[PDB]
Structure formats: structure tokens, C-alpha cells
Amino acid sequence: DCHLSDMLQQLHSVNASKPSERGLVRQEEAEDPACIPIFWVSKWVDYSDKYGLGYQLCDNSVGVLFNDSTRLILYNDGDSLQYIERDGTESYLTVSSHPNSLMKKITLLKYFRNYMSEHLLKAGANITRLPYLRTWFRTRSAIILHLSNGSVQINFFQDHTKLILCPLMAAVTYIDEKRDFRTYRLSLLEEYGCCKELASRLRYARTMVDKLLSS
Ligand SMILES: BrCc1cccc(I)c1
């Protein structure tokens, strides 16, 4: 299930502990820099009416989830490709080899790359295996991005805040409006509690991970 069940369990636990009602809140105490995620989606472009969803990961790699549920990933070296059919079957290729099979999808991918590079701002710019985008959807309030390493990222439209959930670390990273990165250990959030806004977004995240599992 790509650790969705695990993540669901970790969020029910933090939310059940009602961490914004704790009298003596020390959210600063729940931080843990040995849980900082390796990957997250730094930019994305929804062209899903026509071709699909383009994105860039923080390592500068660029991927597309095409409508046919195939994925093409261009590594940060500008040439090496990874290709995933619906089957999940992976294969590796290079741009320079010019594979006749994927000419069209390469061109599309380069368009997405071009657009993102010139027109979009990076997420989490001022801080320091290659997964692909498994699934995604968006509500009025947010886009939800589920990576194949189990990570779930939720980007909120209103205020530009972002959640990155890592079930393997049982951790949450929170990017605020001021672009500040903070990484928390979920269990420690139950103990030290947190602010009302991190709290409501974790309630929203549990509902969103529910939604992923009903599909
Ligand atoms: Br219709 C040209 C095109 C294709 C893929 C992505 C983008 I952004 C634009």
C-alpha cells in the first residue's frame, strides 16, 4: 500500500492526542534534524486536461505523470531517463540515444521542464533511490502528491503552506508562509503539542491520506 496504512496510523495517533489543547505547548521541542526528508516536490504544473502533471523534485530531477498512467523521469544530469509503464515495470534510457519509442513523451517532458524553470518558484529553496509520483489529486484547498517512496506531500493553495509526511521516519515537515523549513517527529508532537495551525493541517492530512486509500 506504499506505507499509506502506516502514515494513517501515525496521524490518527497524533490527532487523537489533541496536540493544540495541551496547556504547556513546546512545539520547538519536537524538532529533529535527523528526520529531514531526502525528496519533495519543489514545483508542479497541472496540464492534466491535455497531457498530465509535470513536476520537479528538490534534487532538480524532473518528472511527468502522463494521463495514460505512465511516468517519465529525467535525472538531474539532463540525459539519463527512467520510464515507468502502468505495470510498474521500470526501464532506463538516455536522451542522447534518441529512443524512437519515447520521442513524443521526451518532448512533452522538456516542455514541462522549460515552463517550470522559467515561470515557477522553487519550494523550500533556502535549505539543503529516485522516486516518482505515484498518484495525485487536488481539492479546492490543496494538491496532494503521493511519492513512490511513501512520502505524501500536501500543498495548500490559500497561504502557500506545505506538509511533507514521511511514514518511514514517522515525521512531518512543515513549510510556513515565510518559506521556513521545520521537521518534526510525530510522536514528539503528541508529547510537546503544537500550534493550532499545524494541528488543523494534520487533521486535514489524515482525511487526505484516507482519500488516497479509497483508490
Ligand atoms: Br501544448 C505544449 C505543452 C506540452 C506539455 C507541457 C506544456 I507546460 C506545454
Residue numbers in the entry: 371 to 498, 507 to 593
Paper text:
While designed to be a phospho-peptide mimetic, Polotyrin was found to occupy the Tyr pocket, with the iodophenyl moiety occupying the Tyr pocket and the thiophene ring stacking against Tyr481. The binding opens the pocket, flipping both Tyr 481 and Tyr417 out of its way, akin to what a long PBD-binding phosphopeptide would do. This fragment bound in the Tyr pocket in identical pose to Polotyrin, opening the pocket by shifting the two tyrosines.
The human polo-like kinase 1 (PLK1) is a key regulator of chromosome segregation during mitosis, through its essential biological functions in chromosome condensation, cohesin dissociation from chromosomes, mitotic entry, centrosome maturation, kinetochore function, spindle assembly, and exit from mitosis. The PBD recognizes phospho (p)Ser/Thr protein substrates for the kinase catalytic activity of PLKs12. Intriguingly, recent crystallographic studies have identified a hydrophobic pocket within the human PLK1 PBD, located adjacent to the phosphosubstrate binding groove, which may regulate substrate recognition. Seven hydrophobic amino acid residues line the pocket; whilst V415, L478, and F482 cover the bottom of the pocket, the Tyr residues Y417, Y421, Y481 and Y485, form its sides.
